[PDB]
Amino acid sequence: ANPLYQKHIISINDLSRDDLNLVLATAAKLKANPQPELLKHKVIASCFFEASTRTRLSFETSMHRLGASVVGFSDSANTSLGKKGETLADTISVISTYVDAIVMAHPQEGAARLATEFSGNVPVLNAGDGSNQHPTQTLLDLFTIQETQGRLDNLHVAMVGDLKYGRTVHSLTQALAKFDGNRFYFIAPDALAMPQYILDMLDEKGIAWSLHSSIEEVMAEVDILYMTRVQKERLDPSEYANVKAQFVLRASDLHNAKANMKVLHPLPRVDEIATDVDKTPHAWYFQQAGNGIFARQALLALVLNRDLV
Amino acid sequence: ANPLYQKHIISINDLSRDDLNLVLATAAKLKANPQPELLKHKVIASCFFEASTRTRLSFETSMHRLGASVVGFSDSAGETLADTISVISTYVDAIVMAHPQEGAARLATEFSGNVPVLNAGHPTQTLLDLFTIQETQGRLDNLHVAMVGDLKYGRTVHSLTQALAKFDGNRFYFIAPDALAMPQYILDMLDEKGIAWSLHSSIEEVMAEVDILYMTRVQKERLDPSEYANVKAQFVLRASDLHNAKANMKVLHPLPRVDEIATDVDKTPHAWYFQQAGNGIFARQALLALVLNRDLVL
Amino acid sequence: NPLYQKHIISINDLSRDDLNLVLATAAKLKANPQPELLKHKVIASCFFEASTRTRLSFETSMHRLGASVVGFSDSANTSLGKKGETLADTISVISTYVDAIVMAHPQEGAARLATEFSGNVPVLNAGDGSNQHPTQTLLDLFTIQETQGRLDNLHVAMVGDLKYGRTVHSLTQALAKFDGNRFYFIAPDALAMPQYILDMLDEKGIAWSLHSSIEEVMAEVDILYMTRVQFVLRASDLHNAKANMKVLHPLPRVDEIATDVDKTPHAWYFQQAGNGIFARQALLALVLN
Ligand SMILES: [Ca+2]
Ligand SMILES: [Cl-]
């Protein structure tokens, strides 16, 4: 009855549409009736090998909102882990003898799937592995889309900025591609284009996507405008001309936006969303960030508790 | 109702006298009678953009003594700060922050929404100073208070002087190098209120009269090295200086100390800087409890 | 109990009876958890020296008993390097906040120095970054006791860097407080077990011998205790091992234990690390109740 019990959460690709809807339904229930003791007597490792203050504080808050305890580190440079040449595999194996679940973010794509080979029984939750996947960002993104659009089907969704290195949009496009009738607009520098493996997937599913050279040319029809930061720390040095944001959203761009349209951003932002956007009714990134608590609580509850909420 | 509920606490002098009295009464109540589940189901951010280890550990201990959960960062190892605050304020019930840049905490209050911001670096230092005085002397009025060291640039003695001047009948003794004197605008306020103060070049000459001796550093940057070499010993406290001390007298120091309190002071009955530091727990518990809990602890 | 409010700086300060009390308590807590035992305690996790595995193990143990934690995970991140911040004053202040202090520090004796300034507050030494500190030897002993059923009359082989792997020095001294144990030391000449350890065993009438390989003694060993050079064990070397034999390693390991050992029934270094939780729970419960 709880298909996420004790499941590793590494990639959206591994989750089903029903899985996504179950997390979202559980998040709305907990948002409505908190369960502050549900994970009492659990200890969870917050292992941010790659620092990400917003995501870690979101995850750790969600742990505490369910009554779990927390141990961990905020950056692998603040640790002695690996300093003698030992493997990440061994680090995970040892930590897995301590805790009831491992939340990990790591600079290398695939590191979270590697961890699942060595964690024995303990679930690994991928809080972001380099430029690859970010499945819990997608879960809070979907909860937010569901909340503001009333549905996850038949949406016009624009994704802007660094689509190549953006783990956020890899996971979110895969998830939305599990629903029906969605239409994608990709607005990105040529060098930071959405990768081919995402495009082939949409093709094989018969899902329409197209490339666009401006936000304005798609503004009138988008329901969700998903903005991203250039992943400066992941760019190849030959991609240095792409560090500066090529597409900037300003309040004036919203003059012909649909009444229901919301602008999302996984955050942090550089200048791709000007601060005059913050005051409009379309700005929804901080609401989105707040919904991460409910999405991440839901996931933690479903993974760590045998039965449903 | 509780007048500090959901209030930002950025500066000590934003506190009315009634609110100061409320904090101090609440600290005393919690110290005598702990309330270990008061902040159960609260999550508090401990946001130390620049490390301030002793202050962070004190604040976080205070959170746990009240049953609250804690998330944060202990060190970073304007536009982003605004967004950082906006994001964290969607997670937590209160933000405790230390930040080295001018105006950072007040700017945080513009972007935290309904989430109160508590400045850790600062208001809780003057609060724990006052709490420690009130607890060791039984009152905050009609005291003899000596302050020693860099009285010109020390913000902590300025705040303590200003706060103690809101109580009646205190007599002040300022003991400082001539170049680091208590500034005129403080003196002017004491003058106009009829509060007696005097200057003294030695700790010993007022030791017989003082209830609180509040010690601070005289840093080498402040004086010429020829002057520093001749003057510093006048502002160093040694155990032998305490010969004529009243039995109630307490030696305070906001910490860290360098050499201005010799270690032989540490085991006299008058040394009280470590107990004062421990009182930060109760001062910080009080502020957290009043800001975060709608109802007063009865 | 005799450990109440006591500093735990060095395992050699513990008698045989003290070791038994910790191990018995560890076993009791493993059998029947006590999740609220240290409810309303706040414990300081002061890792001046990072030692992250030991830190995570210690903090998990605190949480499994219901205590709260404050601390820092490396000196470099703190303000304890600024002028006037001394270790003595830092401990003096922290001991007004917390109910106990767990501390690792890069300099030898740092934890013992801290007991001079912590007042009534117990200090628990977590080492200098290495695996020599009391709870490591306690979890080693707990793991030997649990798997072998005893701490007496064992055949213990210690392999690797026996000169600088000080945890083998502690473990040998601890096991020499028990009865009838026999030691096999397998190490290069430059990294051989220190003479002061051999003399100690001699004084106790405890048998030991040096061996050039582990195949020489494998059929008789009960515990194979491996160390990292501050002699590579492979799955095929275990063919003639006794059914009770267990391979231990304080960790981290590099190449001295090939990963094909991990799947064999004798690999026990990750179970051993897991036992850190119960040894550390036990120490904290006894020191604070
Ligand atoms: Ca525009
Ligand atoms: Cl993947």
Helices A285-304 + B79-88 axis angle, to 10: 40
- Contact across the interface for B256 and C76, Cβ inside 8 Å: no
Cα gap A182→A176, rounded to integer Å: 7
Helices A17-32 + A285-304 axis angle, to 10: 100
| Locus of tokens 């409890």 | B289
> Which tokens in the block code for residue A27?
């998040």
CA distances from A239 to A188, A198, A244, B141, C145 (A): 13, 21, 11, 68, 59
- Closest by CA position to A288, among listed A160, A143, A159, A188: A143
Number of inter-chain CB pairs under 8 A, A vs B? 47
Grouping H, G, I as helix, E, B as strand and the rest as coil, residue A261 is coil
The answer to whether residues B163 and B267 belong to one domain is yes
| Ligand nearest to the CA of residue A132, numbered in listed order | 2
Please say whether the beta carbons of B127 and B283 come within 8 A: yes
DSSP sequence for A88-141 = HHHHHHHHHTT-SEEEEEESSTTHHHHHHHHSTTSPEEEEEETTS--HHHHHHH
Q: How far A292 CA lies from chain B's nearest CA (Å)?
A: 9
- Contact across the interface for A43 and C63, Cβ inside 8 Å: yes
d(CA A88, ligand 2 centre) in Å: 17
The answer to whether residues A186 and A257 belong to one domain is yes
- Contact across the interface for B256 and C68, Cβ inside 8 Å: no
The answer to whether residues A145 and A282 belong to one domain is yes
| Locus of tokens 């414990």 | C43
CA distances from A49 to B20, B104, C103 (A): 44, 28, 23
- Contact across the interface for B87 and A36, Cβ inside 8 Å: no
Please give the residue of chain C at the shortest CA–CA distance from B46: C70
Please say whether the beta carbons of A60 and A46 come within 8 A: yes
Q: What angle do CA B199, B205, B206 make, to 5 degrees?
A: 70
Cα gap A46→A56, rounded to integer Å: 7
Q: Which H helix or E strand runs over B135?
A: helix B123-137
Query: Given in angstroms, what resolution was this structure solved at?
Result: 2.0
| Ligand nearest to the CA of residue A225, numbered in listed order | 1
The answer to whether residues B158 and B55 belong to one domain is no
Task: Quote the distance between the C-alpha of residue C109 and its chain's center.
Answer: 17
Cα gap C48→C13, rounded to integer Å: 23
Q: How far C253 CA lies from chain A's nearest CA (Å)?
A: 6
Q: How far apart are the first and last CA of chain B?
A: 12
Which residues of chain C have a CB within 8 Å of the CB of A40? 35
Q: Which residues pair with B214 in a beta bridge?
A: B147, B252
The size of chain C, in residues, is 289
Instruction: Report the 10 Å Cβ neighbour count for B202.
Output: 13
Please give the residue of chain A at the shortest CA–CA distance from C36: A41
CA distances from B227 to B152, B153, B236 (A): 16, 17, 15
The widest CA-to-CA distance across chain C, in whole angstroms, is 61
- Closest by CA position to B108, among listed B204, B221, B10, B17: B10
| Ligand nearest to the CA of residue A187, numbered in listed order | 1
The answer to whether residues B51 and B106 belong to one domain is yes
| Ligand nearest to the CA of residue A124, numbered in listed order | 2
> Which tokens in the block code for residue C143?
């793991």
DSSP sequence for B234-267 = GG-B-GGGGTT--TT-EEE--S--SSSB-GGGTT
CA-based torsion, C60, C62, C67, C70: positive or negative: negative
Q: Write down the number of H helices and E strands in chain B.
A: 9, 9
Please give the residue of chain B at the shortest CA–CA distance from C88: B263
Task: Answer whether residue B4 is part of any domain.
Answer: yes
Cα gap C73→C244, rounded to integer Å: 38
Cα gap B138→C13, rounded to integer Å: 45
CA-based torsion, C147, C148, C149, C154: positive or negative: negative
The answer to whether residues B245 and B273 belong to one domain is yes
- Closest by CA position to C210, among listed C198, C222, C199: C198
d(CA B243, ligand 1 centre) in Å: 76
CA distances from B235 to A7, A128, A211, B150 (A): 65, 56, 73, 9
- Contact across the interface for C60 and A43, Cβ inside 8 Å: yes
Q: How far A85 CA lies from chain C's nearest CA (Å)?
A: 6
The answer to whether residues B77 and B142 belong to one domain is no
* Residue ranges of chain A whose CB lies within 8 Å of a chain C CB: 40-41, 43, 45, 69, 71-73, 78-81, 84-86, 90-91, 93-95, 97-99
d(CA A288, ligand 2 centre) in Å: 24
> Which tokens in the block code for residue B49?
């953009």
| Locus of tokens 């089907």 | A153
The answer to whether residues A49 and A14 belong to one domain is yes
Among C42, C98, C121, most B C-beta atoms within 10 A, so best to mutate, is C42
Out of A64, A78, A290, closest to residue B71 by CB = A64
Q: What angle do CA A187, A188, A189 make, to 5 degrees?
A: 145
The answer to whether residues A112 and A170 belong to one domain is no
Cα gap A276→A280, rounded to integer Å: 8
Grouping H, G, I as helix, E, B as strand and the rest as coil, residue C138 is helix
Q: What residues contact B175, with CB distance under 8 A and at least 6 apart?
A: B146, B147, B148, B149, B199, B200, B201, B202, B203, B206, B234, B235
Which residues of chain B have a CB within 8 Å of the CB of C84? 217, 255-258
CA-based torsion, B280, B281, B282, B286: positive or negative: positive
Task: Answer whether residue B298 is part of any domain.
Answer: no
Please say whether the beta carbons of C52 and C73 come within 8 A: yes
Identity of residue B214? Y
- Contact across the interface for C271 and A97, Cβ inside 8 Å: yes
Region of residue B261 (phi > 0: left; psi between -120 and 50: alpha; otherwise: beta): beta
Instruction: Report the 10 Å Cβ neighbour count for A274.
Output: 14
Q: What angle do CA A102, A104, A107 make, to 5 degrees?
A: 160
The answer to whether residues C86 and C199 belong to one domain is no
The set of chains that have 3 or more CB pairs under 8 A with A is B, C
- Contact across the interface for B54 and C94, Cβ inside 8 Å: yes
| Ligand nearest to the CA of residue A134, numbered in listed order | 2
Alpha helices in chain A (DSSP H): 17-32, 53-65, 88-96, 111-118, 135-149, 167-176, 196-204, 216-219, 285-304
The answer to whether residues C224 and C154 belong to one domain is yes
What is the tally of structural domains in chain C? 2
Out of C40, C89, C98, closest to residue B36 by CB = C40
Q: How far C201 CA lies from chain A's nearest CA (Å)?
A: 31
Cα gap A235→A179, rounded to integer Å: 31
Query: What CATH number should be reported for the domain holding residue B49?
Result: 3.40.50.1370
Q: Which residues pair with A211 in a beta bridge?
A: A186
Q: Which residues pair with A273 in a beta bridge?
A: A249
For C73-168, strand residue ranges (E) read: 100-104, 123-125, 155-159
Grouping H, G, I as helix, E, B as strand and the rest as coil, residue A230 is coil
Residue range(s) defining the domain that contains residue B19: 1-120+280-293
The set of chains that have 3 or more CB pairs under 8 A with C is A, B
Please say whether the beta carbons of B84 and B104 come within 8 A: no
> Which tokens in the block code for residue C245?
């034999």
d(CA A254, ligand 1 centre) in Å: 9
- Contact across the interface for C129 and A80, Cβ inside 8 Å: yes
Cα gap B12→B124, rounded to integer Å: 8
- Closest by CA position to C275, among listed C254, C253, C246: C246
Which residues of chain A have a CB within 8 Å of the CB of B72? 57
Q: How far apart are the first and last CA of chain A?
A: 11
- Closest by CA position to C160, among listed C219, C201, C240, C214: C214
The answer to whether residues A189 and A259 belong to one domain is yes
Q: How far B57 CA lies from chain C's nearest CA (Å)?
A: 6
